[PDB]
Symmetry: C3
Subunit: 30 residues, 3 copies
Amino acid sequence: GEIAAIKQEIAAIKKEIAAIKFEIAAIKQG
Amino acid sequence: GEIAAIKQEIAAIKKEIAAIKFEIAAIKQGYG
Amino acid sequence: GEIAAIKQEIAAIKKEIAAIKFEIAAIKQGYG
């Protein structure tokens, strides 16, 4: 259960990193 | 132990992500 | 190997975050 939750958190963080990289690229366009 | 250390790392990472998102919010509003 | 894989994921995330923090500094930087 603890392991399931930690892996879920890792996936959510990677999801945010992906989101961040797209935001940064949009800012650079300009 | 091992699992505990992994949780501290994940917790510190989450703070860094929150700071980055806010910085990005600030930049898009002309505060950076 | 499974727990080592989780530790690799964490080290990779840390490298991505440091690179992001550099990119944000570069977006912000002026001639100061």
